[PDB]
A paper describes a structure:
Here we show asymmetric reconstructions of herpes simplex virus 2 (HSV-2) B- (containing scaffold proteins inside, putative capsid assembly intermediate), C- (DNA-filled capsid, derived from the enveloped virion by using detergent treatment to remove viral membrane proteins and outer tegument proteins) and virion-capsids (enveloped intact virion) at 8.1, 9.0 and 10.2 Å respectively. The asymmetric reconstructions reveal a unique portal vertex in the context of the icosahedral capsid, including 1 portal, 11 pentons, 3 types of hexons (P, peripentonal; E, edge; C, center) with the hexameric rings formed by VP26s, 320 triplexes (Ta-Tf) and 12 pentagram-shaped capsid vertex specific component (CVSC) densities (composed of a UL17 monomer, a UL25 dimer and a UL36 dimer, presence in C- and virion-capsids). Radially colored representations of the three reconstructions reveal the dodecameric portal situated beneath one of the pentameric vertices; but, the density surrounding the portal displays a five-fold symmetrical assembly, highlighting the symmetry-mismatch structural features.
The presence of scaffold proteins, some of which possibly associate with the portal, is observed in the B-capsid. A comparison of asymmetric reconstructions of the portal vertex of the three capsids reveals notable differences in the position and morphology of the portal and PVAT. Strikingly, the portal in the B-capsid situates inwards by ~30 Å. It exposes itself by lacking the PVAT and forms a basin at the portal vertex, suggesting a ready-state for docking of terminase complexes and genome packaging, when compared to those in the C- or virion-capsids. Interestingly a novel network of subunit contacts is observed between the portal and PV-Ta and varies each other in three capsids.
Residue numbers in the entry:
A (entry chain K): 106 to 168, 176 to 215, 220 to 353, 416 to 441, 445 to 466
B (entry chain J): 5 to 165, 168 to 252, 258 to 318
C (entry chain I): 5 to 166, 174 to 230, 235 to 262, 267 to 318
D (entry chain B): 6 to 50
E (entry chain E): 198 to 208, 212 to 342
F (entry chain F): 100 to 345, 360 to 589
G (entry chain E): 394 to 442
H (entry chain F): 1032 to 1374
Amino acid sequence: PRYHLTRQVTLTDLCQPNAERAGALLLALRHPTDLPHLARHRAPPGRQTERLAEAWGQLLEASESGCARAGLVSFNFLVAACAAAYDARDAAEAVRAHITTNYAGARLDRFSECLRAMVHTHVFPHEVMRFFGGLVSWVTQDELASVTAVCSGPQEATHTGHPGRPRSAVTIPACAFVDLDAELCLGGPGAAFLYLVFTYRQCRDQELCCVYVVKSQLPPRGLEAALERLFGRLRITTCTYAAFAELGVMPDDSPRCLHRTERVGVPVVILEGVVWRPGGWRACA
Amino acid sequence: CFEADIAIPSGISRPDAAALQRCEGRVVFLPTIRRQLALADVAHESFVSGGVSPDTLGLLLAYRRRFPAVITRVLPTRIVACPVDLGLTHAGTVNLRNTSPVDLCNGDPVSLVPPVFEGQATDVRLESLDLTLRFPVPLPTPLAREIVARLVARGIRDLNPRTPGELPDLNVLYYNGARLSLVADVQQLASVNTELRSLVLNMVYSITEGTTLILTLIPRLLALSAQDGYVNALLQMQSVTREAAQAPMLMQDGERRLPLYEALVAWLAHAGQLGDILALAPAVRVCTFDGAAVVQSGDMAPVIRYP
Amino acid sequence: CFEADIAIPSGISRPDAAALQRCEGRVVFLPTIRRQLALADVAHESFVSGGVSPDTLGLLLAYRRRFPAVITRVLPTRIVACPVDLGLTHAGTVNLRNTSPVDLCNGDPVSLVPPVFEGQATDVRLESLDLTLRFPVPLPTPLAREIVARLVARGIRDLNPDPDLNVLYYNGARLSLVADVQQLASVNTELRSLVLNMVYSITEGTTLILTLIPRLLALGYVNALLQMQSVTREAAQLIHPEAPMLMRRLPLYEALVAWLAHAGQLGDILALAPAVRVCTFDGAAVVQSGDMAPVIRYP
Amino acid sequence: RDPPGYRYAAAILPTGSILSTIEVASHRRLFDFFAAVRSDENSLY
Amino acid sequence: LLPMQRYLDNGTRVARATLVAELKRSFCDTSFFLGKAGHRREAIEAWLVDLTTATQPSVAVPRLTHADTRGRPVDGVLVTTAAIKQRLLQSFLKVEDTEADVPVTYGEMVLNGANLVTALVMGKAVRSLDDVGRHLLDMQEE
Amino acid sequence: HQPLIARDGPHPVEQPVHNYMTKVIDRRALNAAFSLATEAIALLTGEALDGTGISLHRQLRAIQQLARNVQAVLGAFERGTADQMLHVLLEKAPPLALLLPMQRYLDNGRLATRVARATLVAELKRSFCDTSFFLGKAGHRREAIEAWLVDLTTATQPSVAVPRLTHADTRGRPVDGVLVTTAAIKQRLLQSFLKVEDTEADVPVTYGEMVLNGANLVTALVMGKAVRSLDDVGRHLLDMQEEQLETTRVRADLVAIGDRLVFLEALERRIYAATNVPYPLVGAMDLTFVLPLGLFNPAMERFAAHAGDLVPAPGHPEPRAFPPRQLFFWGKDHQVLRLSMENAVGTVCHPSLMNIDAAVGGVNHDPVEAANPYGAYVAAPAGPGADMQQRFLNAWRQRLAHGRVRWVAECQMTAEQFMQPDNANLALELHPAFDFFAGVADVELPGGEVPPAGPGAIQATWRVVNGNLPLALCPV
Amino acid sequence: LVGAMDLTFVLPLGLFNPAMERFAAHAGDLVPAPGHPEPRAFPPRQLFF
Amino acid sequence: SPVALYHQLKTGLHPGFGFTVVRQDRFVTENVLFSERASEAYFLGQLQVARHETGGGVNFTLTQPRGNVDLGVGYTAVAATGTVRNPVTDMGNLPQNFYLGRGAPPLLDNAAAVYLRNAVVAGNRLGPAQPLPVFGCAQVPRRAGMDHGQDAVCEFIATPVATDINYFRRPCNPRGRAAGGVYAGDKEGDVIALMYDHGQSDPARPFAATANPWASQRFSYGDLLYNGAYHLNGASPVLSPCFKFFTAADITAKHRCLERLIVETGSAVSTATAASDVQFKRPPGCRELVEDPCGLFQEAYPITCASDPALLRSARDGEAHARETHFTQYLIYDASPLKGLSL
Amino acid sequence: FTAADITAKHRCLERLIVETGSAVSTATAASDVQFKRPPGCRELVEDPCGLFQEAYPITCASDPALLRSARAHARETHFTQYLIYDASPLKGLSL
């Protein structure tokens, strides 16, 4: 009834919502204790199936099940994680400077080795880490993080956007100029859809990752017309690159911005007025 | 709902105001998400691309990247519409007007089709401002997927006209009886080619390394249609599979890779969802509160969200 | 919530009064959304359509047809159940009853068919009025779409016999799918309906394009772009199927329509669309089997 | 096209009550203006 | 009429056909029904009560008090081509209750007052607007 | 407590029962609704008004519309109780000529001898076939319809209750019968049968419909509307006047049958005028009709009934002695029709004629021993051809005479094979295209010289022709 | 009220009976004198009304 | 063979065996009800104004839970059913088609499979659509115009030709044997062997075992086509009148008490529906209250049909001079509740 | 025999009978042999054949010998001859 709330107790090895902002696209970490088994299948046996067991085993070594299963990869954490991956330098080192000063970069290097290894053994980081919400509060202890991070569609950014104007409320930072690929260059006035897009390419730049957002007044069923375009990475030859899940709707087209204010100079985008229509992933070819 | 107002521009002829009075519950294709819009961007002149108007395949191609909305209220200066793709978040259950020869059901998923029958023209005329409004035809999703497959193969007949000039129709549809006639007029090349490419593309990705294991079981089916009644109706009379029998090849990479299990999901992901790539996506589900089990041709149906 | 009231029939036995109490939180498929509903309309005998009790094919048609409903409160002479598909998105939090997988903090459960597990499990049968309630199984979408392709693969090995497919390890779960003693004789005979579709529409799908592409690309942009993607991937298996098997436009074009509708139905029959979502608050977010989970409306 | 609607302030003081009650669609092809509401409508006001 | 009026009560494509198949069987059998079966008396007393009950009595007009015959009011016409009227009563229904009735004179309807303005200054000239305007101005003030 | 009669005789002192009868309530809902638009919610509540007289008068139409809906739907329960009573009378209404033999059986004591059960039924089916549709079948017969109403009335027992409020007379007699009839019969029935005292003298005002339902329904939604509360609260004084559209006694019809004063009144013009609900006392009857096609006339019944009639012209061969392939009958008109076995090609030429895989495996439970298998076994040919008959008469000589071989059941005639004696082989005749018979279990059809004595199994053979189905089922 | 009424009538010329209905109603009816051709076997060409 | 039977019947050679023909008609009848003084007590309850919101304004619902009771120690309120308005059915001549049913194991020879299938269905009213679809129904394609009404469907049971015609002209069964549980004798082993044993005698014909050897026995093509378990029809939508007979479970455990059985006769549920063009078996949401006497006594009434038209003219206006038989041509006079009536 | 006459007729049985009170005949009463209607003429005949689109038999027969028994007890058929009994609203009438 245009109001909902979430709350989950996780650890501070990942996102660490103290150094993060009030606006944070918290993704999950779906099933860490999984993938010795499905990493073995869903791939040819000439893919070295023990790789996600070891590289994530190094990532858990970089810091048992505990009283909190490993969750909450931020959207901050992924920008540095593919910073060497997408073809953009000096705009990607700033967010990595935001993490190695305020979040240990060993947790980045073990994770980027997993990002190559996830696409190596064909078990992609999508259908992993579903969207979680918008981080209203962080009541975090020394080891824990009990974040109220409301899911459930349109109201989650309006309940953090109606009282936003006074002081500092959510504002939902896109957190990179290279990310938030704001589409409709050939565009006019209308309410746009937000998506969460992961592009892929097998053995070109060695199972490459790119983590960013697109903004379009295009349907998710017509987005594949544009997602098949706009890329040079159509030359795998197997398949299933360019996954996307709908982040929802931006019903204020003028409200996209360009700024550089965070924490370390981190280039950023204010996104005023968001529907968080949570959607699902869509990856076939 | 995100109520979208469509401005009724200039004058209005006294029957042209009544033209909008009978359209409460039809479907507006609007090529944006607006809170304010003028009427000419909706009309069939706005469907017209560079130079030509689209044919019955290109209309779906126009309808694909154009967002459906339903007329909810009728005012002489505005037409308050509700965008189904977004604003279907209702405890209000926006109604739909059946404009078809077809009783749907209570609960069938409903998608939209252009006017493609001989008597269901539905193109209204406005003498004040010369606009045509071909309203789409809300139809059940087994019926719509049975329509679109007819036009595609007829367009492939328009590619290569070998045999002499006595072809079968692909102009005859049956739905609970009811020999329905389509409109077979003109087939535009690009509207064929864009629809032809996706069908050939999607069926190639439906064959994986473990797919040819299923091809081994072709004489297994023909033994079953000789001694089972369910199989006999399943292998139809005009089937190419019955003509096909007129092959394991182990070659096992690793010998544990789940060879069937990848061939099913990939077939389910690629050639299974042919109804989403040829036609529009289903979003309309018939939800009758008072206990009506059917929705007659010309009646109203309260509508809830995705199937 | 517009909670539609299912009417209990007239007086039942005292164990039948206690049995319907422990169904508080199961999934119920109501055909119409009248505020007064009988209980025989709810029961599995109302799913009898072709003069037979249906298989998992006939259930998935019926489950893709009528409207889901979670039992809210069980009352004397009444069942108060609010349906899922009415209401706006993410309103009306209510409880599901878990079944053996975990159902984490999100995951979008699917009310999918009861015979995916042991055959006469959860079949609440009232001895008094003599009906049957077969409650469906609420599993999440990647665990839904995996298993429903996993069981149809197993029937192929039984359809013509000579690795065990049924492992499917989850995050904490070693999913024992095999009920070998008496259920695999009864679960395999119920996918007899669903397998023969899945075999046919593949073999009608592959063998159509195996005689389409030799008869096409021979009379423009179709030839350029499609072969641009299938450079020695599908062409490698084109020479493989045409040689290690057998090889008329008008039978083919009349078979083009017939497969595509039938292949189109399996996209709605299978693939298990997310009905509802889990999104928890003030909760431990990792749900035990047999524990109530807060569950909200739209994907 | 149509006659100028029905006038709802007229027949708030009705000059005569109809002496016979039937289903009205039994002579649907008889009338010139016709509107069959469902227990209330928006155009009544 | 008599089948067609019967299905208008509680009234279906078969009900269309079982109407029409049963419509023509009556018309082939019950027509010219004073010439046919006119010798016997019972079928014509049934025939007259088929005329007088088939119709619908509908509109209450007391503006003409056509109530006649010491108080028992008239509700029919039966214009009946007098060579038949000689034969109807003298055997079947010689029930002449009286030979005298009570009709009325014309009531007239003239643009007396406000209707002369509304027909001219406006277009519309709604009947008895002297009384309807009185009834509309009596309701809202309470 | 049931009426008892003190009984004499040498019988055991019969078992005395004096108990409390328990009964089963039903719950029925009687749902009713009324819409209310997107106007009259902004109106009636103060939410959309002004000081203008028209905005005060836009309210009044929507005020009067609730005067017209609420009086209808609260009237609808009174219109609905009479709909419910005619069902729950017809739910327990056993049709007559299934109660006239039934009560005369129970105007005996009751007879558990099972013969008088059977003499009930074979006469229960007879009284129905005679007088089901009695009026119209015997409509012109006066004094049989007089005898019909007196059987319609008195056959029911007055159920044991005092309703404490007696429907009176205008002369003297309390009223007990109801006699609900349709409107087309009552016109035919009042015109002949008097029809005394046309006024019900009493129908008292007990709590019967309600006094508070007119007040509860307007009040329960008032706080639900919560600002249209005082709209309908101030309405009800002026509601009844403007919606008029400018113990006690009720005029009802009375007849007396024998000595029973009943309320003979037809509905459907009062409570079912234009409600589109069917009148519940019009009730479909489903019969089934046997029209035996293509059969053959029995032996003594092939006469002419006179020597020359139905005679062709002398150049023509007199067809009628050919076996009759046709069947002619009237339809839903005059309309002679035609069945004519060429129309039966959609039944038997369908290839479900040849399925006995459900039969021969099914019938094979409790197998008979292989009794005298003379015509059932096939030997392989062996030895020289010259004496193959000879050792067949040397070897088989025991079991060939051990019993009567089955396939001379020839001396059975018409209506001898259809009966139990000498026809154990009745239950081995099952299919028109198949001769079922007992045979060996595991021995193949060919082979051998003398069949090994094994457990017999009932098996099938395909009938090659039509001529070789037996002569008692296809006479000479 | 004295008015007309139009009707259309259908009469068969020259048709022939079906195979079952070419009987005589009795053996000894409608025979001519014993030198005469029995014209009732002839296919009809006429009608009488 | 059912290809050789195709050439005999369409040409006109009698195949050495005869048919009995069962056909279910539906007559809309008047009623006269009676009742006694206190026939049924009646309860009231309360009103429970329940609201709902739709497209537009609010929608209120009112429903009052209420109760009745029997209150009768003896029988009360008979319902004499005396007049007929119209037969809804045409009363004949629609041949039952088994090609709508897919439960039949077909022929092996695939040339013979499709030649036999289309040579029947060149023009049948009961012919399916193009194929049978696996999901849906074959719809039995509607004709554009219809006159008499709902077409009653004639089902055919093979019989020997040497059954006595005296078995008919009488309300007898089609299965050559009495079968109902009204006839039963309370052994608790009764209607398994009343219906399927053939050492004992027919009840209706006590002097013979069964008048019809094919239809009466278990597993015997009057059983195999039309029993409820084997379902060669049951995917087909067309009403099977012989499902009223021939069915195992319905004639079994369902009900036994004759004193209870007659109040549940005039309230019974039809297999057909009258709203359908061709009569179909009942869709799951439908209730047609039908008297239906043949469901109780387990019988079927013969109507007048004679194999000549020459006999058929004679059995007009009375059976006084009805030409009841003539050399091979047999006449049956109407034995039904509709005897002595117009239709 | 005329498609345009049948197709131009509306199908509602509410109104089809009220032009079966008065329909315009295609025949006039004035001319000696019945003429097709001169186009400005409104005759208002009752016209029952136009509704059902059905026509009627009257008493006719091919023998006069059959016809003499047409005054039920009629000799209804004979060697190749035939009779048709009256089936019309004129049955049971003199003229």
